[PDB]
Amino acid sequence: CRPCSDTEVLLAICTSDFVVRGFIEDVTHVPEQQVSVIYLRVNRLHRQKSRVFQPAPEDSGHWLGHVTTLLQCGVRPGHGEFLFTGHVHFGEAQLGCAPRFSDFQRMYRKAEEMGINPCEINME
């Protein structure tokens, strides 16, 4: 439940199955599996797998999908905008990292200035 390190986030945006910017729509807990399901409204879709995220008809420019997280993380999900990264197995997305988006932007700009980011992304 510790946040990903900055190093982990920089690698994740290059190698993770999905990378999206967005916000939480709803949270449902699944105690039997000790996970929470986090429904996400995505406004920038950088990469994904297995069509986890699909267009929201009414809400132009946005996608909707859901990801799983350890229940310890889903009970204090937080507020605001995030960069979500993670992995897709058997059609189900599981969250890897979720820095606050404004924190991510600051970290990434510094990494880019240093030249240490292994890959480039532009989430606006």
mmCIF file of N, CA and C in Angstrom:
data_model
loop_
_atom_site.group_PDB
_atom_site.id
_atom_site.type_symbol
_atom_site.label_atom_id
_atom_site.label_comp_id
_atom_site.label_asym_id
_atom_site.label_seq_id
_atom_site.Cartn_x
_atom_site.Cartn_y
_atom_site.Cartn_z
ATOM 1 N N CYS A 1 0.815 -1.208 0.000
ATOM 2 C CA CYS A 1 0.000 0.000 0.000
ATOM 3 C C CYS A 1 0.854 1.265 0.000
ATOM 4 N N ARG A 2 2.156 1.113 0.205
ATOM 5 C CA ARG A 2 3.051 2.237 -0.010
ATOM 6 C C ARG A 2 2.909 2.703 -1.460
ATOM 7 N N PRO A 3 2.925 4.010 -1.713
ATOM 8 C CA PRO A 3 2.940 4.460 -3.110
ATOM 9 C C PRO A 3 4.147 3.906 -3.847
ATOM 10 N N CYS A 4 3.976 3.745 -5.158
ATOM 11 C CA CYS A 4 5.108 3.461 -6.025
ATOM 12 C C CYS A 4 6.162 4.551 -5.866
ATOM 13 N N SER A 5 7.427 4.150 -5.897
ATOM 14 C CA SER A 5 8.515 5.109 -5.981
ATOM 15 C C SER A 5 8.484 5.818 -7.330
ATOM 16 N N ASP A 6 9.139 6.978 -7.383
ATOM 17 C CA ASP A 6 9.276 7.678 -8.657
ATOM 18 C C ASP A 6 9.949 6.799 -9.706
ATOM 19 N N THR A 7 10.965 6.023 -9.315
ATOM 20 C CA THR A 7 11.584 5.107 -10.272
ATOM 21 C C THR A 7 10.563 4.111 -10.798
ATOM 22 N N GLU A 8 9.738 3.555 -9.906
ATOM 23 C CA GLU A 8 8.743 2.581 -10.325
ATOM 24 C C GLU A 8 7.730 3.195 -11.284
ATOM 25 N N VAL A 9 7.311 4.435 -11.029
ATOM 26 C CA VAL A 9 6.361 5.071 -11.936
ATOM 27 C C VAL A 9 7.002 5.320 -13.296
ATOM 28 N N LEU A 10 8.263 5.735 -13.321
ATOM 29 C CA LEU A 10 8.893 6.028 -14.606
ATOM 30 C C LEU A 10 9.009 4.781 -15.468
ATOM 31 N N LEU A 11 9.319 3.646 -14.850
ATOM 32 C CA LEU A 11 9.358 2.386 -15.575
ATOM 33 C C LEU A 11 7.954 1.938 -15.977
ATOM 34 N N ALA A 12 6.982 2.160 -15.098
ATOM 35 C CA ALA A 12 5.623 1.694 -15.354
ATOM 36 C C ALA A 12 5.025 2.365 -16.577
ATOM 37 N N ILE A 13 5.277 3.662 -16.763
ATOM 38 C CA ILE A 13 4.644 4.319 -17.898
ATOM 39 C C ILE A 13 5.213 3.792 -19.210
ATOM 40 N N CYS A 14 6.369 3.128 -19.169
ATOM 41 C CA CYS A 14 6.921 2.511 -20.367
ATOM 42 C C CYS A 14 6.494 1.060 -20.566
ATOM 43 N N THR A 15 6.303 0.286 -19.499
ATOM 44 C CA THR A 15 6.117 -1.154 -19.616
ATOM 45 C C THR A 15 4.740 -1.672 -19.208
ATOM 46 N N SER A 16 3.951 -0.904 -18.467
ATOM 47 C CA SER A 16 2.677 -1.391 -17.976
ATOM 48 C C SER A 16 1.675 -1.585 -19.108
ATOM 49 N N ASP A 17 0.778 -2.539 -18.895
ATOM 50 C CA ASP A 17 -0.228 -2.839 -19.903
ATOM 51 C C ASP A 17 -1.147 -1.646 -20.145
ATOM 52 N N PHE A 18 -1.500 -0.897 -19.089
ATOM 53 C CA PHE A 18 -2.320 0.299 -19.272
ATOM 54 C C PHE A 18 -1.756 1.489 -18.502
ATOM 55 N N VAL A 19 -1.967 2.673 -19.080
ATOM 56 C CA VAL A 19 -1.536 3.969 -18.560
ATOM 57 C C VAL A 19 -2.655 4.933 -18.951
ATOM 58 N N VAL A 20 -3.346 5.499 -17.962
ATOM 59 C CA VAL A 20 -4.480 6.383 -18.210
ATOM 60 C C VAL A 20 -4.475 7.489 -17.167
ATOM 61 N N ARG A 21 -4.974 8.654 -17.563
ATOM 62 C CA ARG A 21 -5.236 9.755 -16.652
ATOM 63 C C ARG A 21 -6.735 9.814 -16.405
ATOM 64 N N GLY A 22 -7.138 9.979 -15.159
ATOM 65 C CA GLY A 22 -8.555 10.108 -14.901
ATOM 66 C C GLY A 22 -8.905 10.252 -13.447
ATOM 67 N N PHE A 23 -10.163 9.959 -13.149
ATOM 68 C CA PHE A 23 -10.656 10.106 -11.793
ATOM 69 C C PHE A 23 -11.589 8.960 -11.444
ATOM 70 N N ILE A 24 -11.730 8.743 -10.138
ATOM 71 C CA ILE A 24 -12.567 7.675 -9.625
ATOM 72 C C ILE A 24 -14.032 8.051 -9.813
ATOM 73 N N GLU A 25 -14.816 7.086 -10.282
ATOM 74 C CA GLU A 25 -16.257 7.175 -10.468
ATOM 75 C C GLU A 25 -17.028 6.530 -9.329
ATOM 76 N N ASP A 26 -16.566 5.383 -8.849
ATOM 77 C CA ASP A 26 -17.239 4.606 -7.822
ATOM 78 C C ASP A 26 -16.256 3.564 -7.320
ATOM 79 N N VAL A 27 -16.486 3.094 -6.105
ATOM 80 C CA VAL A 27 -15.665 2.054 -5.502
ATOM 81 C C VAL A 27 -16.597 1.007 -4.927
ATOM 82 N N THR A 28 -16.361 -0.254 -5.282
ATOM 83 C CA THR A 28 -17.054 -1.385 -4.688
ATOM 84 C C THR A 28 -16.022 -2.320 -4.070
ATOM 85 N N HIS A 29 -16.295 -2.806 -2.866
ATOM 86 C CA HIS A 29 -15.385 -3.738 -2.226
ATOM 87 C C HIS A 29 -15.827 -5.173 -2.476
ATOM 88 N N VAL A 30 -14.831 -6.043 -2.603
ATOM 89 C CA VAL A 30 -15.042 -7.473 -2.788
ATOM 90 C C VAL A 30 -14.317 -8.190 -1.657
ATOM 91 N N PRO A 31 -14.880 -8.214 -0.448
ATOM 92 C CA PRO A 31 -14.108 -8.718 0.701
ATOM 93 C C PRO A 31 -13.630 -10.152 0.535
ATOM 94 N N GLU A 32 -14.415 -11.006 -0.125
ATOM 95 C CA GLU A 32 -14.029 -12.403 -0.281
ATOM 96 C C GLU A 32 -12.696 -12.553 -1.005
ATOM 97 N N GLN A 33 -12.366 -11.626 -1.904
ATOM 98 C CA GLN A 33 -11.081 -11.619 -2.595
ATOM 99 C C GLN A 33 -10.123 -10.573 -2.051
ATOM 100 N N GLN A 34 -10.517 -9.854 -1.002
ATOM 101 C CA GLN A 34 -9.678 -8.832 -0.380
ATOM 102 C C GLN A 34 -9.187 -7.820 -1.404
ATOM 103 N N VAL A 35 -10.077 -7.455 -2.321
ATOM 104 C CA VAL A 35 -9.782 -6.429 -3.302
ATOM 105 C C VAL A 35 -10.930 -5.436 -3.307
ATOM 106 N N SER A 36 -10.638 -4.255 -3.822
ATOM 107 C CA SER A 36 -11.650 -3.273 -4.160
ATOM 108 C C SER A 36 -11.671 -3.116 -5.670
ATOM 109 N N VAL A 37 -12.861 -2.901 -6.207
ATOM 110 C CA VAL A 37 -13.024 -2.574 -7.614
ATOM 111 C C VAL A 37 -13.251 -1.077 -7.721
ATOM 112 N N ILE A 38 -12.398 -0.412 -8.492
ATOM 113 C CA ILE A 38 -12.432 1.035 -8.658
ATOM 114 C C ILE A 38 -12.889 1.332 -10.082
ATOM 115 N N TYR A 39 -14.069 1.939 -10.211
ATOM 116 C CA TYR A 39 -14.573 2.380 -11.500
ATOM 117 C C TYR A 39 -13.991 3.752 -11.820
ATOM 118 N N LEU A 40 -13.455 3.884 -13.029
ATOM 119 C CA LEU A 40 -12.674 5.038 -13.443
ATOM 120 C C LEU A 40 -13.300 5.722 -14.647
ATOM 121 N N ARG A 41 -13.305 7.045 -14.626
ATOM 122 C CA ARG A 41 -13.662 7.873 -15.775
ATOM 123 C C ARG A 41 -12.346 8.447 -16.293
ATOM 124 N N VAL A 42 -11.925 7.987 -17.461
ATOM 125 C CA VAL A 42 -10.619 8.324 -18.023
ATOM 126 C C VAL A 42 -10.786 9.465 -19.013
ATOM 127 N N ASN A 43 -9.916 10.470 -18.929
ATOM 128 C CA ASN A 43 -9.936 11.566 -19.889
ATOM 129 C C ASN A 43 -8.727 11.576 -20.818
ATOM 130 N N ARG A 44 -7.690 10.780 -20.543
ATOM 131 C CA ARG A 44 -6.596 10.568 -21.487
ATOM 132 C C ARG A 44 -6.192 9.107 -21.425
ATOM 133 N N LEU A 45 -6.195 8.426 -22.553
ATOM 134 C CA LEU A 45 -5.869 7.005 -22.601
ATOM 135 C C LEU A 45 -4.554 6.846 -23.354
ATOM 136 N N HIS A 46 -3.473 6.567 -22.613
ATOM 137 C CA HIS A 46 -2.175 6.453 -23.262
ATOM 138 C C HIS A 46 -1.954 5.066 -23.853
ATOM 139 N N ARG A 47 -2.384 4.023 -23.154
ATOM 140 C CA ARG A 47 -2.178 2.652 -23.600
ATOM 141 C C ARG A 47 -3.102 1.754 -22.801
ATOM 142 N N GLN A 48 -3.535 0.654 -23.408
ATOM 143 C CA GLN A 48 -4.271 -0.347 -22.641
ATOM 144 C C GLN A 48 -4.176 -1.705 -23.337
ATOM 145 N N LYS A 49 -4.848 -2.700 -22.738
ATOM 146 C CA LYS A 49 -4.894 -4.097 -23.175
ATOM 147 C C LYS A 49 -6.305 -4.621 -22.939
ATOM 148 N N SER A 50 -6.784 -5.464 -23.856
ATOM 149 C CA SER A 50 -8.024 -6.232 -23.702
ATOM 150 C C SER A 50 -9.268 -5.356 -23.545
ATOM 151 N N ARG A 51 -9.205 -4.117 -24.030
ATOM 152 C CA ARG A 51 -10.348 -3.211 -24.066
ATOM 153 C C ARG A 51 -10.955 -3.013 -22.682
ATOM 154 N N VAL A 52 -10.095 -2.889 -21.671
ATOM 155 C CA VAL A 52 -10.586 -2.601 -20.327
ATOM 156 C C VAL A 52 -11.412 -1.325 -20.338
ATOM 157 N N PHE A 53 -10.912 -0.297 -21.017
ATOM 158 C CA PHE A 53 -11.541 1.019 -21.055
ATOM 159 C C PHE A 53 -12.255 1.205 -22.387
ATOM 160 N N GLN A 54 -13.516 1.635 -22.334
ATOM 161 C CA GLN A 54 -14.337 1.794 -23.523
ATOM 162 C C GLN A 54 -14.996 3.161 -23.532
ATOM 163 N N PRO A 55 -15.283 3.699 -24.716
ATOM 164 C CA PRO A 55 -15.852 5.054 -24.783
ATOM 165 C C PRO A 55 -17.150 5.199 -24.002
ATOM 166 N N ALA A 56 -17.266 6.330 -23.301
ATOM 167 C CA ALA A 56 -18.524 6.735 -22.689
ATOM 168 C C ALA A 56 -19.328 7.489 -23.730
ATOM 169 N N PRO A 57 -20.456 6.944 -24.232
ATOM 170 C CA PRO A 57 -21.193 7.646 -25.295
ATOM 171 C C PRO A 57 -21.555 9.080 -24.928
ATOM 172 N N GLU A 58 -22.332 9.271 -23.858
ATOM 173 C CA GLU A 58 -22.768 10.618 -23.496
ATOM 174 C C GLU A 58 -21.580 11.543 -23.253
ATOM 175 N N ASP A 59 -20.542 11.034 -22.588
ATOM 176 C CA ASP A 59 -19.445 11.856 -22.078
ATOM 177 C C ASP A 59 -18.301 11.835 -23.088
ATOM 178 N N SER A 60 -18.441 12.667 -24.120
ATOM 179 C CA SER A 60 -17.441 12.737 -25.175
ATOM 180 C C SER A 60 -16.059 13.008 -24.593
ATOM 181 N N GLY A 61 -15.045 12.441 -25.242
ATOM 182 C CA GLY A 61 -13.671 12.583 -24.820
ATOM 183 C C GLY A 61 -13.249 11.691 -23.677
ATOM 184 N N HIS A 62 -14.153 10.869 -23.147
ATOM 185 C CA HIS A 62 -13.892 10.084 -21.952
ATOM 186 C C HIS A 62 -14.146 8.601 -22.203
ATOM 187 N N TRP A 63 -13.503 7.780 -21.370
ATOM 188 C CA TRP A 63 -13.688 6.339 -21.354
ATOM 189 C C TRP A 63 -14.078 5.895 -19.949
ATOM 190 N N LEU A 64 -14.695 4.722 -19.856
ATOM 191 C CA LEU A 64 -15.060 4.149 -18.568
ATOM 192 C C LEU A 64 -14.506 2.735 -18.482
ATOM 193 N N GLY A 65 -14.020 2.367 -17.302
ATOM 194 C CA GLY A 65 -13.568 1.010 -17.064
ATOM 195 C C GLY A 65 -13.414 0.819 -15.572
ATOM 196 N N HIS A 66 -12.982 -0.372 -15.179
ATOM 197 C CA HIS A 66 -12.737 -0.632 -13.767
ATOM 198 C C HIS A 66 -11.436 -1.403 -13.600
ATOM 199 N N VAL A 67 -10.803 -1.183 -12.449
ATOM 200 C CA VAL A 67 -9.531 -1.797 -12.105
ATOM 201 C C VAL A 67 -9.675 -2.348 -10.696
ATOM 202 N N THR A 68 -8.836 -3.316 -10.364
ATOM 203 C CA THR A 68 -8.832 -3.813 -9.000
ATOM 204 C C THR A 68 -7.604 -3.321 -8.239
ATOM 205 N N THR A 69 -7.756 -3.242 -6.924
ATOM 206 C CA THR A 69 -6.695 -2.807 -6.030
ATOM 207 C C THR A 69 -6.877 -3.584 -4.737
ATOM 208 N N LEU A 70 -5.790 -3.722 -3.984
ATOM 209 C CA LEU A 70 -5.894 -4.366 -2.686
ATOM 210 C C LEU A 70 -6.904 -3.604 -1.845
ATOM 211 N N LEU A 71 -7.696 -4.334 -1.060
ATOM 212 C CA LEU A 71 -8.723 -3.679 -0.260
ATOM 213 C C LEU A 71 -8.128 -2.609 0.645
ATOM 214 N N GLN A 72 -6.916 -2.809 1.144
ATOM 215 C CA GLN A 72 -6.257 -1.826 2.040
ATOM 216 C C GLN A 72 -6.099 -0.499 1.297
ATOM 217 N N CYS A 73 -5.951 -0.528 -0.027
ATOM 218 C CA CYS A 73 -5.798 0.690 -0.863
ATOM 219 C C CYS A 73 -7.158 1.279 -1.242
ATOM 220 N N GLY A 74 -8.193 0.460 -1.430
ATOM 221 C CA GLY A 74 -9.496 0.943 -1.920
ATOM 222 C C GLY A 74 -10.349 1.625 -0.870
ATOM 223 N N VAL A 75 -10.042 1.439 0.409
ATOM 224 C CA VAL A 75 -10.858 2.007 1.523
ATOM 225 C C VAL A 75 -10.475 3.473 1.735
ATOM 226 N N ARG A 76 -9.273 3.869 1.350
ATOM 227 C CA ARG A 76 -8.839 5.286 1.403
ATOM 228 C C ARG A 76 -8.404 5.586 -0.013
ATOM 229 N N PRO A 77 -9.332 5.544 -0.989
ATOM 230 C CA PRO A 77 -8.943 5.659 -2.391
ATOM 231 C C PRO A 77 -8.375 7.052 -2.675
ATOM 232 N N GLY A 78 -8.969 8.081 -2.076
ATOM 233 C CA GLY A 78 -8.516 9.456 -2.291
ATOM 234 C C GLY A 78 -9.416 10.239 -3.212
ATOM 235 N N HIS A 79 -9.047 11.472 -3.502
ATOM 236 C CA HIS A 79 -9.823 12.422 -4.277
ATOM 237 C C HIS A 79 -9.008 12.946 -5.445
ATOM 238 N N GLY A 80 -9.698 13.453 -6.453
ATOM 239 C CA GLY A 80 -9.038 14.212 -7.492
ATOM 240 C C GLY A 80 -8.595 13.340 -8.649
ATOM 241 N N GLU A 81 -7.586 13.862 -9.339
ATOM 242 C CA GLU A 81 -7.128 13.298 -10.598
ATOM 243 C C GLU A 81 -5.861 12.480 -10.393
ATOM 244 N N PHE A 82 -5.736 11.390 -11.146
ATOM 245 C CA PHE A 82 -4.599 10.492 -10.973
ATOM 246 C C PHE A 82 -4.041 10.066 -12.323
ATOM 247 N N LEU A 83 -2.781 9.659 -12.324
ATOM 248 C CA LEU A 83 -2.237 8.833 -13.395
ATOM 249 C C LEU A 83 -2.281 7.395 -12.896
ATOM 250 N N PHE A 84 -3.090 6.561 -13.549
ATOM 251 C CA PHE A 84 -3.247 5.156 -13.199
ATOM 252 C C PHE A 84 -2.422 4.288 -14.144
ATOM 253 N N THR A 85 -1.618 3.388 -13.591
ATOM 254 C CA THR A 85 -0.911 2.406 -14.405
ATOM 255 C C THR A 85 -1.195 1.007 -13.870
ATOM 256 N N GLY A 86 -1.048 -0.006 -14.720
ATOM 257 C CA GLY A 86 -1.217 -1.352 -14.207
ATOM 258 C C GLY A 86 -1.196 -2.395 -15.298
ATOM 259 N N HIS A 87 -1.679 -3.573 -14.922
ATOM 260 C CA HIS A 87 -1.485 -4.811 -15.656
ATOM 261 C C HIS A 87 -2.836 -5.438 -15.931
ATOM 262 N N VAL A 88 -2.930 -6.126 -17.056
ATOM 263 C CA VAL A 88 -4.171 -6.777 -17.426
ATOM 264 C C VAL A 88 -3.891 -8.260 -17.574
ATOM 265 N N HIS A 89 -4.632 -9.070 -16.830
ATOM 266 C CA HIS A 89 -4.557 -10.516 -16.954
ATOM 267 C C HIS A 89 -5.946 -11.104 -17.058
ATOM 268 N N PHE A 90 -6.158 -11.905 -18.098
ATOM 269 C CA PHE A 90 -7.428 -12.580 -18.282
ATOM 270 C C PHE A 90 -8.548 -11.556 -18.320
ATOM 271 N N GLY A 91 -8.249 -10.433 -18.960
ATOM 272 C CA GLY A 91 -9.214 -9.390 -19.223
ATOM 273 C C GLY A 91 -9.521 -8.479 -18.061
ATOM 274 N N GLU A 92 -8.836 -8.637 -16.935
ATOM 275 C CA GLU A 92 -9.120 -7.877 -15.726
ATOM 276 C C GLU A 92 -7.916 -7.012 -15.386
ATOM 277 N N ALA A 93 -8.142 -5.714 -15.257
ATOM 278 C CA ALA A 93 -7.060 -4.783 -14.983
ATOM 279 C C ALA A 93 -6.817 -4.724 -13.486
ATOM 280 N N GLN A 94 -5.542 -4.752 -13.106
ATOM 281 C CA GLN A 94 -5.156 -4.600 -11.715
ATOM 282 C C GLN A 94 -4.208 -3.420 -11.607
ATOM 283 N N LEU A 95 -4.461 -2.578 -10.616
ATOM 284 C CA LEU A 95 -3.727 -1.335 -10.464
ATOM 285 C C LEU A 95 -2.305 -1.600 -10.008
ATOM 286 N N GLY A 96 -1.360 -0.915 -10.642
ATOM 287 C CA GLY A 96 0.029 -0.954 -10.228
ATOM 288 C C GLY A 96 0.454 0.286 -9.463
ATOM 289 N N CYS A 97 0.248 1.452 -10.068
ATOM 290 C CA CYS A 97 0.596 2.742 -9.484
ATOM 291 C C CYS A 97 -0.553 3.716 -9.716
ATOM 292 N N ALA A 98 -0.687 4.691 -8.818
ATOM 293 C CA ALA A 98 -1.715 5.715 -8.991
ATOM 294 C C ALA A 98 -1.288 7.010 -8.314
ATOM 295 N N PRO A 99 -0.201 7.617 -8.753
ATOM 296 C CA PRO A 99 0.166 8.936 -8.219
ATOM 297 C C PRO A 99 -0.899 9.975 -8.555
ATOM 298 N N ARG A 100 -1.090 10.942 -7.652
ATOM 299 C CA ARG A 100 -1.896 12.114 -7.978
ATOM 300 C C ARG A 100 -1.345 12.744 -9.247
ATOM 301 N N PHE A 101 -2.236 13.195 -10.126
ATOM 302 C CA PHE A 101 -1.747 13.560 -11.451
ATOM 303 C C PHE A 101 -0.789 14.744 -11.372
ATOM 304 N N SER A 102 -1.116 15.747 -10.555
ATOM 305 C CA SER A 102 -0.243 16.906 -10.439
ATOM 306 C C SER A 102 1.111 16.529 -9.853
ATOM 307 N N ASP A 103 1.147 15.547 -8.946
ATOM 308 C CA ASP A 103 2.433 15.047 -8.463
ATOM 309 C C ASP A 103 3.189 14.345 -9.584
ATOM 310 N N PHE A 104 2.487 13.528 -10.366
ATOM 311 C CA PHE A 104 3.130 12.839 -11.470
ATOM 312 C C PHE A 104 3.735 13.823 -12.462
ATOM 313 N N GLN A 105 2.981 14.867 -12.827
ATOM 314 C CA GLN A 105 3.479 15.827 -13.806
ATOM 315 C C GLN A 105 4.784 16.454 -13.346
ATOM 316 N N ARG A 106 4.862 16.790 -12.064
ATOM 317 C CA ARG A 106 6.061 17.420 -11.528
ATOM 318 C C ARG A 106 7.238 16.459 -11.556
ATOM 319 N N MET A 107 7.013 15.221 -11.128
ATOM 320 C CA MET A 107 8.070 14.218 -11.171
ATOM 321 C C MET A 107 8.555 14.007 -12.596
ATOM 322 N N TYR A 108 7.622 13.839 -13.530
ATOM 323 C CA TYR A 108 7.977 13.534 -14.910
ATOM 324 C C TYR A 108 8.749 14.685 -15.548
ATOM 325 N N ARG A 109 8.339 15.931 -15.287
ATOM 326 C CA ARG A 109 9.060 17.067 -15.849
ATOM 327 C C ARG A 109 10.498 17.094 -15.349
ATOM 328 N N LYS A 110 10.706 16.813 -14.059
ATOM 329 C CA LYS A 110 12.066 16.734 -13.537
ATOM 330 C C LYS A 110 12.829 15.587 -14.192
ATOM 331 N N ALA A 111 12.199 14.412 -14.307
ATOM 332 C CA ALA A 111 12.900 13.295 -14.939
ATOM 333 C C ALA A 111 13.285 13.653 -16.368
ATOM 334 N N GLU A 112 12.364 14.280 -17.101
ATOM 335 C CA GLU A 112 12.631 14.652 -18.482
ATOM 336 C C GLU A 112 13.778 15.649 -18.559
ATOM 337 N N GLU A 113 13.789 16.627 -17.649
ATOM 338 C CA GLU A 113 14.885 17.592 -17.584
ATOM 339 C C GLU A 113 16.222 16.902 -17.360
ATOM 340 N N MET A 114 16.237 15.882 -16.509
ATOM 341 C CA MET A 114 17.457 15.142 -16.240
ATOM 342 C C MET A 114 17.814 14.188 -17.369
ATOM 343 N N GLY A 115 16.853 13.841 -18.216
ATOM 344 C CA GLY A 115 17.084 12.864 -19.253
ATOM 345 C C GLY A 115 17.009 11.423 -18.809
ATOM 346 N N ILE A 116 16.477 11.144 -17.614
ATOM 347 C CA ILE A 116 16.492 9.787 -17.073
ATOM 348 C C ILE A 116 15.217 8.991 -17.349
ATOM 349 N N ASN A 117 14.209 9.593 -17.948
ATOM 350 C CA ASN A 117 12.995 8.858 -18.263
ATOM 351 C C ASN A 117 13.242 7.898 -19.419
ATOM 352 N N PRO A 118 13.020 6.574 -19.251
ATOM 353 C CA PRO A 118 13.326 5.609 -20.312
ATOM 354 C C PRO A 118 12.421 5.766 -21.539
ATOM 355 N N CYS A 119 11.258 6.387 -21.372
ATOM 356 C CA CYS A 119 10.322 6.632 -22.495
ATOM 357 C C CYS A 119 9.552 7.925 -22.267
ATOM 358 N N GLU A 120 8.880 8.402 -23.305
ATOM 359 C CA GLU A 120 8.134 9.673 -23.227
ATOM 360 C C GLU A 120 6.630 9.417 -23.259
ATOM 361 N N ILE A 121 5.862 10.218 -22.533
ATOM 362 C CA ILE A 121 4.379 10.173 -22.606
ATOM 363 C C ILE A 121 3.928 11.629 -22.623
ATOM 364 N N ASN A 122 2.721 11.913 -23.103
ATOM 365 C CA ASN A 122 2.150 13.283 -23.022
ATOM 366 C C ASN A 122 0.685 13.118 -22.628
ATOM 367 N N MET A 123 0.354 13.329 -21.354
ATOM 368 C CA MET A 123 -1.035 13.165 -20.832
ATOM 369 C C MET A 123 -1.695 14.542 -20.783
ATOM 370 N N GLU A 124 -1.113 15.541 -21.460
ATOM 371 C CA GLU A 124 -1.680 16.914 -21.583
ATOM 372 C C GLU A 124 -1.242 17.765 -20.387
#
